[PDB]
């Protein structure tokens, strides 16, 4: 078994994978491109999507949240227990024209010096008044600035159809004749101000099969010892994985040698008797629901 | 290919798949089986595992522990760690532990001792494995409060608020990397791709290349990617630089399926 031959086939599959993922038939031109280094807005965007926090390639764009001295803070005021992050939807629509195009939207915050557990919640601004809890995070202390990332795809999709819309990141509240715990009485929560202020990172579209097989324990295996279930849908994977560019169903991982294999499995709980006490055991990965070439 | 021949072979493979998952050489002797129907306590426990609600190779044993004796603003659930120590006998055997429970308008709940969930109008399940791990180390309980928002307007702060429970547990009973040139297992192997050197490609401006890697090795069944990572790239169309993200480009680990 020659790993050097596998590398050869892996490499040629890479060539096809990248072109097909970009829905190109052949690599594009250049020379209309000037020489030297990329613009820093491009590098910032590219760096943003490499920061750590469907088949076809997504265009990546970035829209930074409106600067904090505009009408932010004309009304509700930034703080250390609550931060406010507003976005010009016309700029969002500039980066992703129609909402159907959006595939993922991430809200990115650069967290500061932290030295105690802060539990924070993300809220969306609505009508013109109220808020909807979106999600929360439990942040371990750290003396290193780390980026936070929140998935806000559904919200941004709506914005892509108001004109100024915002988020709020606040502190959590314990609720229990009712008692409440407070954080906001000591002394900016996360980075606002500057060109590492919060931004929306946007990904958008631009402008071998599972085969049914039912196993009956008695009928197929002569097995009486399993009292439940009487049978189950094991199913299985079969069909070729060959190699315009389909590539998306035949070799989407660009293996040197794709195989039809289970993509998603799920368990099978059984009831049977060991000695004469009943057991209930969960067997992992017994049922094939989908297959893929990989 | 005859699909019927492969069906014949999957069927005979299920025979050994089930038995080796149970670490059994042959189906257990059933000449001592208590006759007739099976205990409804057992069936209720089977029912609870089979059905799901808002949410390793070898067979894990399944055990359930109900709750002992409040509002519609909070629900307090207690269990004695005695009764749970009888289910999972030693704490390191614990594979997973779920808490089970059973409206007109949205409401938003919280678990303290953790997680929280939003319930839609019309059971329920919470993963509490780590909390139930240490409880097996004497009486502990769970907090299901309601959620509240708080913020600051002037000097003004504001707050707003809008078959018994059961603990289901699974337990065990009482990834390769190659750098060698040796093929003995299925493993991820290193492979660096240089766009210019390997493909003759000058049009990708940022990543000069990347560690694509690949899977390879025998399995007692193919060696395939388990975890992949995306690759972002920068190139120009016309005078326009573009950032694109490509999924499933980098193999980080391999499995056999």
């Amino acid at each position, epitope marked *: 078994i020659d790993m050097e031959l596998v590398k050869r086939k892996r490499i040629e599959a890479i060539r096809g994978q990248i072109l097909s993922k970009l829905r190109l038939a052949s690599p594009p031109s250049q020379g209309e491109v000037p020489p030297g280094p990329l613009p820093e807005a491009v590098l910032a965007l590219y760096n943003s999507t490499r920061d750590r926090v469907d088949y076809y390639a997504k265009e990546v764009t970035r829209v930074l949240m409106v600067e904090t001295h505009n009408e932010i803070y004309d009304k509700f005021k930034q703080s250390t227990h609550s931060i406010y992050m507003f976005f010009n939807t016309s700029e969002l629509r500039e980066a992703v024209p129609e909402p159907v195009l959006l595939s993922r939207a991430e809200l990115r915050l650069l967290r500061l010096k932290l030295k105690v557990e802060q539990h924070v919640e993300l809220y969306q601004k609505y009508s013109n008044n109220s808020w909807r809890y979106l999600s929360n995070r439990l942040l371990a202390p750290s003396d290193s600035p780390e980026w936070l990332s929140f998935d806000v795809t559904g919200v941004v999709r709506q914005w892509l159809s108001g004109e100024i819309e915002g988020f709020r990141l606040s502190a959590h509240c314990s609720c229990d004749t009712l008692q409440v715990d407070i954080n906001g009485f000591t002394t900016d929560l996360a980075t606002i101000h500057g060109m590492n202020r919060p931004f929306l990172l946007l990904m958008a579209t631009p402008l071998c099969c599972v085969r049914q097989l039912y196993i009956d324990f008695r009928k197929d295996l002569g097995w009486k010892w399993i009292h439940e279930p009487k049978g189950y849908h094991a199913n299985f994977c079969l069909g070729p994985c060959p190699y315009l560019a389909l590539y998306n169903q035949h070799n989407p991982g660009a293996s040197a040698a794709p195989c039809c294999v289970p993509q998603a499995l799920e368990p099978l709980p059984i009831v049977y008797y060991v000695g004469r006490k009943p057991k209930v055991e969960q067997l992992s990965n017994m049922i094939v629901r989908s297959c893929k070439c990989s | 290919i005859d699909m*019927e021949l492969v069906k014949r072979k999957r069927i005979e493979a299920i025979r050994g798949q089930i038995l080796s998952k149970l670490r059994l050489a042959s189906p257990p002797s059933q000449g001592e089986v208590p006759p007739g129907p099976l205990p409804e306590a057992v069936l209720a426990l089977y029912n609870s595992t089979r059905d799901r609600v808002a949410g390793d190779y070898y067979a894990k044993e399944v055990t359930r522990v109900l709750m002992v004796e409040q509002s519609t603003h909070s629900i307090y659930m207690f269990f004695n760690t005695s009764e749970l120590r009888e289910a999972v006998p030693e704490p390191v055997l614990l594979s997973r532990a779920e808490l089970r429970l059973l409206l007109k308008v949205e409401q938003h709940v919280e678990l303290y001792q953790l997680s929280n969930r939003l319930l839609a109008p019309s059971w329920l399940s919470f993963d509490v494995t780590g909390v139930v791990r240490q409880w097996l180390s004497e009486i502990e309980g769970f907090r299901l409060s309601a959620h509240c928002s708080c913020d600051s307007r002037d000097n003004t702060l504001q707050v707003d608020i809008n078959n018994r429970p059961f603990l289901l547990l699974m337990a065990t009973p009482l990834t390769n990397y190659c750098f060698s040139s040796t093929e003995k297992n299925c493993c991820v192997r290193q492979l660096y791709i240089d766009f210019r050197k390997d493909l003759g490609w000058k049009w990708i401006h940022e990543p000069k290349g990347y560690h694509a890697n690949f899977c390879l090795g025998p399995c007692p069944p193919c060696c395939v990617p388990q975890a992949l990572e995306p690759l972002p790239i920068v190139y120009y169309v016309g005078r326009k630089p573009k950032v694109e993200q490509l999924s499933n480009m980098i193999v980080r680990s391999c499995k056999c399926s």
Partner: antibody
Amino acid sequence: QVQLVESGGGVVQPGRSLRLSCAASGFTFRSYVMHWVRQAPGKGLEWVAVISHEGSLKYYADSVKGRFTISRDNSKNTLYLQMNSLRAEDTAVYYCARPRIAARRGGFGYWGQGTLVTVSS
Amino acid sequence: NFMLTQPHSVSESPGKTVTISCTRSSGNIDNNYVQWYQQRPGSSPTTVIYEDNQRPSGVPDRFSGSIDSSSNSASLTISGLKTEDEADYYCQSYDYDTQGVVFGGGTKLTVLG
């Protein structure tokens, strides 16, 4: 396509022995378990015997156990049945049958045309 | 092995529907899949139902298989009877204690003419 042609049926003095053949075309005969089934004039089908595709494993009905022997040879894609100490009871049309996944699951997917053996004097 | 008992014969008029029963003598009918073969005189048999209720391609939906656990039997049902359905029908199952294949005695179906 998928076909099973049998030969060697005939008339045999009672205590003697024939060997039926069943040549197979249209499929990888090597991979398949194979069966023999028989039918006495006017009476039902009667499963006779089976072999694994390798040789190896053989099972028989009680009615023929000590007497009949199955064999196959994959190099000729041909299944055989050495019958021993024939009787008028064994007078029947003999079919070779290929199972559908397994006889116990989906029965027999294909049959030969049959050869008649009549055991008389 | 166990026994599968079918009626010696059934008959019905053309267009009508008829059922052929296949009773198992011992052990639960649900222990094993039941198969149904059609055999025309002179022909070798062919499948009309397998795995209790599945039709091979080209077998019309007038042929259906079913199982009555309450009476430990399998039933072949043929609707819209046509002259061509006249044949002998065999059920077939498996035992697991004899590792053997068991056939019913067969039923002659007459389409009344």
